[PDB]
Structure 1
Amino acid sequence: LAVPGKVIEVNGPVAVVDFGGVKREVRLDLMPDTKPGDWVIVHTGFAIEKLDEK
């Protein structure tokens, strides 16, 4: 039920992400290596993976 979002801010294991314009927080307990440059997949407020240059 996940939608893709652009990470705009990171604060330890508590990144923040944007989805087509929505600001929502996202835990990073599954993706410790997330830089604001990365785009993540959010599932119930969590990060499961990071996208690729597909």
Structure 2
Amino acid sequence: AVPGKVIEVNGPVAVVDFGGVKREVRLDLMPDTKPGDWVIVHTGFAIEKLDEKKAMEILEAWAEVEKAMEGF
């Protein structure tokens, strides 16, 4: 199970790049998918997005609260 980068979006179909291999993926379960998005694909369908930016933000937010509650 490898993630892919959306390089093309045309209606309910996207072109996803998995390590240099590009395949067409159905977007019915992730309608707001757009070029640049990183998605998890299962049996030809994108089932969820991967946002490292978001994840890093939540982490930093959490650290900031703990750092502040502890004394730094």
Q: Which runs of 4+ in 1 moved over 3 A?
A: none
Give % identity: 100
Q: List alignment gaps of at least 5 residues for structure 2.
A: 52-72
Report the CA distance between 1:3 and its aligned residue. Answer: 1.5
Q: How many residues align?
A: 51
Give CA-to-partner distance per residue, 1:2-23, whole Å, 9 cap, x none: 3200000000110110001101
The CA RMSD over aligned residues, in Å, is 0.7
TM-score by length of 1: 0.89
TM-score by length of 2: 0.68
Give CA-to-partner distance per residue, 1:6-51, whole Å, 9 cap, x none: 0000001101100011010000010000110101101011010000
Q: Which structure carries more relative contact order (alpha carbon 8 Å, separation 6+)?
A: 1
Q: Which of the pair is proportionally richer in helix?
A: 2
Q: List alignment gaps of at least 5 residues for structure 1.
A: none
Q: Which has the larger radius of gyration?
A: 2
